[PDB]
Design a protein around this ligand. Structure first.
Ligand code: ACO
Ligand code: ACO
Ligand code: TPP
Ligand code: TPP
Ligand code: MG
Ligand code: MG
Lengths: 872, 872
């Protein structure tokens, strides 16, 4: 059992052609670059049958024209090993000790010279010898891990727990990293992980009490929100403190909630870290909250969310100072082996796309694992980049504790069954080298087992409660009754002037300058458009002292060239942000931050959800280029935004801005899928709206921000109505009207006793129906708008309908096909809530498999047909 | 304007320490590895503010301790340039000519020695000088590209076309690759691409007639399916032939349809290629259909689907022999620059994760572009791997032709406006070197313009038609009336025996052997379970002579350990596939292929959809581990599966198998979201079913496969009912019952005149209601099952209800919450279709924000409450 190729027999060769010093330098370079291919990093003596084996002929002395006859000759090595001269025997010895034992390293692909040199120097010095106290501490942590698993196995046999047996070195690795961070003087560590070994990390790293975990197994579950539904035990989070064992440091440790969908926590935990860093406010030399992210081997190589999130690492609105990644490589999926899971040689090969170092370590050598953890945390602090650790280990049982792995992997489980554990091997090694006594080794085991037995008995004394029905979360938060959302006239004029107070030698672009002038004059003469209404809302909130963040694709300029929140000078390329300047000059330390995202919907929306959870007092909004591209983030909508409160008691106030409207641009530029969002709504989970005037958009945003109702808000924004002059607003609507309106009654009814038809509408189709009513002189019709879709404002609709006492019909008019839009939701729910209402009649487009037509002339024909049908 | 650092002044250094020959060899290695960092590959003299500049100090002679005084000394170079000895002046000259001009190359990261040597040899030989005929051919293609763009600009000013101006060298690059493939003797080339330059590729590469394109611009659109809705002009496909210009070769060229969602065509086009290769059947040395895939720079770096699809390249059921990738790098997104789009230095850095070569080429040197195209196609044929080309160019106008790019990128568009085009530069170069006459150069332009003018006039003679309403696609395909789907008794016994005809020294695993015995005995004694019913269906179809493909996560064994389609011997690890053996021994050349996928839902389902389009006569099925993970493939469901026929006239017969059932395993292991699928259904777009007996599943699959209705099928499969003994089937149900049943009436009604309540149910809740009815002895109830959900079998439901003439109530019973499951769909539609039916009454769980509870005791309490409410 020796891992190297034997020395071969050959004749001595002449020193002609390429000199032999050149050949020894090429050998040094080959080991530094490719020595990881023959390193002792696998605990099993296992080669997977269907995977390609890379060529490693570069690592034998025959390929470089050297021979056994050169081993005692002396060569120039140019500073290698801190020496100018050396023998080939000593060169080989040093290379093999540094690159071929229990740690394999990849770092030669890095482009910067100072980075490479730092790693090379530390990797060739070697691992320093640890003290006896340190060694005993590693043994205590290994014992805790294994003991906890065995206890649960014995007391709860059938129950599913996802054990860590085979990979117990994870606990001392995570402990090493957190300890190093506490020594550097940082503030917090945030963890995200999957199912494998979660209950073990909660108890041994985060500090969740043991009574809580035993209660969970007996069927008593802690309640997050009053009337909530809950979730399984390996999807929950917690908080705690960590004290340095040999130091005076202290750090805070947190773990975040997640669903079963793998790798969906990656963008969410990045956002939590960014929000916490922004609140501390320590600058460019700060970045004092550390992200620690755990993965599995199959998931890391397979799912596309992983590289999509790593791509945000060095961008302006997303940087968090680097991420420490740990991949638990146990050489198997569920029933699938690596040959069917990836086309890369290693699972951690995405690192080479981003220019980052990788460390592969054997999971049966605990002292090497502790060294790699320390070295990774130091690299992050100095260079501010991502680092990857690959922990090679195995899985002792099946995927869960009810599965038999021998059915599909017979030969692999011949090597696994009946091994000795990592705790047993380490105890034997220390007793051999005289580093520990037997009394000590026996106390370590006895003490921990007594502790667990004590707690267990205490938990069984208390009787078990019986099951009870879950009530719901509708009334668990209060509604803001009697809140006024209008600003003063002085405040409005100041916001207007912000766009005239340019810096010293700044000029606008000729096509942007008219927009600025109109903003300054409109706050006194009238004609405020949609974009200006939105910015007035965010600006007012930033003045009062809040952090406002807006992110999305092309969101600084706007997709439809409507926003202009940051302007650029054509001559010098200088930037200007008016509303941020005004906010910083009022002495409440408010901020208005606008960012252009990368081209992603899954990672984008996930990052903003995380930001809202990490800072409860910020106002965050994510914008989509068109609302039709939000189905690329369906996982986030279904697993976090729509259902997080009912499952975990985690609340958010994220704002989604989704453009919507039927205008003839085709099936992928027409609908944001209102019907889908209204399906997800129940128990008052979130608010859904489609306003028709800039002032009403202003009031909706301000009510959300100033209330104490911590639930999300989904708005359906316009595309063509942005520049419609019948939709503009007057200044009195921002300063004398006090509240948001959910139903707007018809403003052009001469006499209410002559009405015989009522039309209900939502959105931009109002302005067409109104136009036609004026042209044809119809005094028997009244058009009523619905601005808030969920919840249903049934008291207001009832009040409006009651105002027309001679009505015989009610029509519901929409632009969308009959199986889309708000009609399905309203035809089900509204008749129950208003019993005395006449039967409703739909007027819409026919039902379709796609969203809309692809021909423009057909679109125009359909619209004419629709409006004609509405007016008999 | 010289691109190199000037030679510096220094003193001569002594030849001591590290020898100077060693230093010259290190310089050669540095240029081979990192010389692309200073290559002349950008047509503009532009450096983006905000992007990091890599260190390239390795490329100057000072860092290797050499000086101007060494330039005329002679050194040993070890075969470089085919010489044993050389001067430092000649070394530098050769390195600069190979690695620093118009082509930059990355290949030193490849692990195989033979690959590296092949590339190195061809890259240092240089580009061979082309003939005059070849040069004139390149000029014809450049002219065609530019001329077409200018014509459309002049005749249709406002209309959106997404021009290729700035990147016209793409047309000769694609032509070079297709020409090389025709010389190798291959069969087809399949293309997938986005919006940028699509109408140009359709006319100049694929051969779509010009009349068709002009008609599109005048509003006359070609119809795909009778009564279809359509799509915009830059989302359509076509077919054609390509003849070799200087050869006797011929090849077929195809382009595939796609939606606006970027990069969603990547898995679909890979599947099309695999299906075509399988039909030709030329073996391991075949792989004679070439995939050619075009991207944009922002999309390639940002979206996660790209690396997820590249990861399938070398896997057993997905390999297609390599893919040629082209990235059109025009240095801008929409309004976003590379500094805000990626954290990699180049857009093509994912190549380094997979071990593949990259070529960067200047888009204003057309002869170099043609060389790189040829070299890439040769590399693919020899090594069978992926290859990446980065074409560096610019965008002349805005994102579309209605946008002003100076608002946000002022300095970049100072360099672009008023340049001379690539056609103009190339014409000037050839006239200078005496390679072309003026008469020739003028004829090239005049001839092409005359051709276009001719066609245009012809198109305007014919009058324009007026718009007409679109009718729908419901009746465009026929239903299989009078088809019988039963097999013979002889066929059933033969299928059974397949599991007894083991190879010579094969034995089953002890926990798999009972399953095999039961399969052999059940075909004569009874008790056939769910999994065996499914396999009997697929086996029968493979016997008749069809290719059957089943793919999914852990689909060979089954997630619930139920299928065992391939078995493994514990002693030797040999594999056995019974139903494939039987099919190949019947002389119709049938196949049963089962594969375990990687851990992906987006790339998995996309690949299977593509397979169904590439071979219309195959039976393809994709399986999900649980139906709750299908929201990771929402793009494919919404943009391709649900709506492809109505948009493009593209038909498919894919089968989706989605596990579903409420059993107490929590919110991410309970629902496949039936409500979402029933929203997408209209115009008879696809079939949705939830069967309750193995025989009925058998008949459903066989009706789909033997009919001529080319639409998809979505089935909701069980988890616990897999092993329920009340659900098993007898042999007569496969051999004497002729058809599939859509409604199953109650089999335990003594007297039909005493019934006073009818219950409607679907799925596994039947077996609980039936149980209770027997226990309590209720003769006033009848339970009726619905097996096909869409379309609605309203004639059968009417017939069943009419059989009970004294009924007073109808109850609809489901397990799902009230805002989920089939109730929303049925409460809307069923009362209209059956006017005389009593009012329906719901019995279900309450409405919820999440799918299900997380506590198991609460689940049991809810189920009891539900069934009690049903029975008064
Ligand atoms: C979904 C959520 O965010 S929590 C909703 C929880 N409640 C329910 O779902 C119970 C059933 N629903 C209902 O009774 C109705 O839909 C209601 C009460 C929410 C609204 O019905 P109406 O009375 O017709 O609506 P109206 O617009 O008059 O609202 C009344 C008050 O509620 C407030 N309000 C209503 N919806 C919201 C909301 N989403 N956010 C904040 N305040 C709200 C209004 O500001 C108003 O305050 P005021 O009394 O100071 O003027
Ligand atoms: C969605 C698709 O795949 S195409 C559907 C197109 N048609 C429509 O949508 C029109 C409206 N729909 C209807 O009228 C009804 O829903 C129907 C006609 C589909 C079924 O009505 P019912 O008579 O209640 O159902 P039933 O199951 O008895 O169907 C009768 C016949 O239709 C056939 N059939 C029904 N649905 C399908 C289907 N999805 N695939 C194949 N055959 C089908 C049955 O095989 C049967 O054939 P048979 O006459 O040889 O016995
Ligand atoms: C997105 C998604 N797809 C599929 C699954 C089903 N699933 C659960 S565990 C698992 C295997 C995970 O393998 P690996 O990442 O190696 O985890 P390990 O069991 O080794 O810790 C799969 C496919 C899932 N939960 N989420
Ligand atoms: C999935 C998705 N997200 C967003 C968009 C919106 N969109 C259309 S084009 C575009 C920019 C594409 O940039 P690039 O890939 O460089 O293309 P180019 O215009 O340079 O050809 C974006 C974000 C889209 N169509 N699809
Ligand atoms: Mg694993
Ligand atoms: Mg681009």
């Amino acid at each position: 059992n020796v891992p190297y190729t034997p020395m071969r027999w050959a004749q001595d060769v002449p020193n002609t052609g390429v000199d032999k010093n050149t050949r020894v330098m090429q050998l040094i370079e080959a080991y530094r670059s490719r020595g990881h291919l023959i390193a002792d990093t696998n605990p099993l003596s296992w080669v997977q049958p269907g995977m390609p084996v890379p060529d490693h002929r570069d690592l034998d002395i025959e390929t470089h024209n050297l021979t056994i006859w050169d081993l005692d000759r002396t060569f120039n090595v140019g500073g290698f090993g801190g020496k100018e001269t050396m023998t080939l025997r000593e060169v080989l010895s040093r290379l093999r000790a540094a690159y071929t034992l229990k740690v394999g390293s990849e770092y030669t692909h890095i482009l910067d010279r100072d980075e490479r040199t730092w790693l090379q120097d530390r990797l060739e010095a070697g691992m320093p010898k640890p003290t006896q106290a340190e060694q005993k501490y590693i043994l205590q942590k290994l014992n805790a891990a294994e003991a906890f698993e065995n206890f649960l196995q014995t007391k709860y046999v059938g129950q599913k727990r996802f054990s860590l047996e085979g990979a117990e070195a994870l606990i001392p690795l995570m402990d090493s990293a957190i300890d190093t961070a506490a020594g550097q003087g940082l503030d917090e560590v945030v963890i995200g992980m999957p199912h494998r070994g979660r209950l073990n990390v909660l108890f041994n790293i985060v500090g969740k009490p043991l009574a809580s975990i035993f209660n969970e197994f007996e069927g008593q579950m802690e309640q997050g929100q009053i009337g909530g539904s809950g979730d399984v035990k390996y999807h929950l989070g917690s908080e705690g403190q960590h004290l340095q064992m040999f130091g005076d440091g202290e750090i805070k440790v947190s773990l975040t909630a997640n669903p079963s969908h793998l790798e969906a926590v990656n963008p969410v935990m990045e956002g939590i870290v960014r929000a916490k860093q922004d609140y501390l406010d320590k600058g460019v030399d700060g970045k004092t909250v550390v992200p620690l992210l755990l993965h599995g081997d199959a998931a890391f190589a397979g799912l596309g969310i992983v590289p999509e999130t790593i791509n945000l690492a060095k961008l302006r609105g997303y940087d968090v100072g680097g991420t420490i990644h740990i991949v638990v490589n146990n050489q198997i999926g569920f029933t699938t082996t690596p040959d069917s899971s990836r086309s890369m040689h290693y699972a951690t090969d995405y690192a080479k796309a981003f220019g980052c170092p990788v460390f592969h370590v054997n999971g049966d050598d605990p002292e090497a694992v502790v060294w790699v953890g320390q070295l990774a945390t130091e690299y992050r602090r100095r260079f501010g980049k991502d680092v990857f650790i690959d922990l090679v280990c195995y899985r002792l049982r099946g995927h869960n504790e009810a599965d038999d792995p021998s059915m599909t992997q017979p030969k692999m489980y011949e090597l696994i069954t009946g091994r000795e554990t990592v705790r047993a091997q380490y105890t034997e090694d220390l007793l051999g080298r005289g580093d520990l006594s037997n009394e000590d080794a026996e106390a370590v085991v006895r003490d921990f087992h007594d502790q667990m037995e004590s707690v267990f008995n205490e938990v069984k004394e208390g009787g078990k409660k019986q099951a009870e029905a879950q009530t719901g979360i509708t009334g668990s938060q209060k509604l803001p009754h009697g809140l006024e959302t209008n600003i003063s006239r002085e405040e409005l004029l100041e916001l207007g002037q912000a766009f005239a107070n340019t810096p010293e030698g700044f000029n606008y672009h000729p096509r942007v300058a008219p927009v600025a002038k109109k903003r300054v004059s409109s706050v006194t003469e009238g004609g405020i458009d949609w974009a200006w209404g939105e910015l007035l809302a965010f600006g007012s909130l930033a003045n009062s002292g809040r952090l406002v963040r807006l992110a999305g694709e092309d969101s600084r300029r706007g997709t439809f060239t409507q926003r202009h929140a940051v302007a650029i000078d054509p001559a010098t390329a200088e930037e200007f942000n008016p509303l941020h300047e005004l906010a910083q000059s009022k002495g409440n330390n408010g901020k208005f931050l606008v960012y252009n995202s990368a081209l992603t919907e899954y990672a984008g929306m996930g990052f903003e959800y995380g930001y809202s959870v990490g800072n409860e007092d910020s106002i965050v909004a994510w914008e989509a280029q068109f609302g039709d591209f939000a189905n690329g983030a369906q996982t986030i909508i279904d697993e976090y935004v729509s259902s997080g409160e009912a499952k975990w008691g985690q609340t958010s106030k994220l704002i989604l801005l989704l453009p919507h409207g039927y205008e003839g641009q085709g099936p992928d530029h027409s609908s944001a899928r209102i019907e889908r969002f209204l399906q997800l709504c129940a128990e008052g989970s979130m608010t859904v709206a489609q306003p028709s005037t800039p002032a009403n958009h202003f009031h909706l945003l301000r009510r959300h921000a100033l209330s104490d109702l911590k639930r999300p808000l989904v708005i359906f924004t316009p595309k063509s109505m942005l520049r419609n002059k019948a939709a503009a607003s007057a200044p009195e609507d921002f300063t004398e009207v006090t509240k948001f309106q959910s139903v707007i009654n018809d403003p052009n009814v001469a006499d209410a006793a002559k009405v015989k038809k009522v039309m209900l509408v939502s959105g931009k189709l109002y302005y067409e129906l109104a136009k036609r009513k004026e042209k044809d002189g119809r005094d028997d019709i009244a058009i009523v708008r619905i601005e808030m879709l969920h919840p249903i404002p049934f008291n207001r609709i009832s009040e409006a309908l009651a105002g027309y006492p001679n009505a015989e019909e009610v029509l519901f008019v929409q632009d969308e096909p009959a199986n889309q839009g708000p009609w399905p939701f309203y035809q089900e729910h509204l008749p129950e809530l208003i019993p005395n209402m006449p039967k409703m009649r739909r007027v819409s487009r026919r039902a379709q498999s796609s969203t809309a037509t692809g021909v423009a002339k057909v679109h125009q024909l359909e619209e004419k047909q629709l409006i004609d049908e509405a007016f008999e």
